[PDB]
């Protein structure tokens, strides 16, 4: 396999997050039966970067993170694994401010 | 060659330098009820603008603050501010490396 990695802006990134909430929303209202929640991503601040992990990350009621596998539940829809990296923020400044 | 691109660490330094520029002034004009913030942060078409300049605020309570005043020294017999330059900093859009196939 060749897997490419490509750059998208914040608006595109919210797209990927928003769909992942959308495809688990109908399931997640179903899980009120067992009082657990499937959040389809996990955000990690390591190496002075936002890491934004895509996967099944399970929460139990201050919602505690049980882990990454089903704790007799109904089998959510499939989430890909993948890794999303925030680029460092960058600012357009006029030089004179750097010059002072 | 006026406009260049810097990262958060340098931009944080830029903000930090400005805050030190006004720190001693704000202690001196603490007693007038007045705070001089040397920048103003604006969310316009979903970018974070940071304008550099004199932005004056006053302390008042209503019920239970920091109401904006103006760009200019509110009281003629306060000590003069340090010279903030007027300039515009624009934060670029956040950018993400994504696995290709997650794009459907």
Residue numbers in the entry:
A (entry chain B): 1 to 61, 69 to 78, 81 to 109
B (entry chain A): 3 to 66, 69 to 108
Could you give the paper's own sentences about this structure?
We identify a hitherto uncharacterized protein factor that we term UBP (ucm-binding protein) that interacts sequence-specifically with the ucm and determine the structure of the protein both in isolation and when bound to DNA. UBP is a highly abundant protein, and we reveal that it plays a role akin to bacterial nucleoid-associated proteins with over 300 binding sites on the Sulfolobus chromosome. Importantly, UBP interacts with the N-terminal domains of MCM. Taken together, our data provide evidence that UBP functions as a general nucleoid-associated protein that plays a key role in facilitating the egress of the MCM replicative helicase from DNA replication origins.
To gain further insight into the function of the UBP protein, we determined its structure using X-ray crystallography. The structure of the protein, solved to 2.74 Å resolution, revealed a homodimer. The overall conformation is saddle-shaped with a basic, concave undersurface and more acidic on the outer, convex surface. The concave surface is maximally 32 Å wide with the stirrups at the bottom of the saddle approximately 22 Å apart. Homodimerization is mediated by a reciprocal strand-swap of the C-terminal beta strands of the protomers. This strand interacts with the neighbor, forming a 5-strand beta sheet. The interprotomer interface encompasses 1662.4 Å2. Examination of the structure reveals a potential π-stacking interaction between tyrosine 100 at the base of the C-terminal beta-strand of one protomer and phenylalanine 13 of its partner. We mutated these residues to alanine and in both instances observed an altered profile on gel filtration chromatography in agreement with destabilization of the dimer and an elevated population of monomer species. Our initial determination of the homodimeric structure of UBP in the absence of DNA suggested the establishment of a symmetric structure of UBP at the origin.
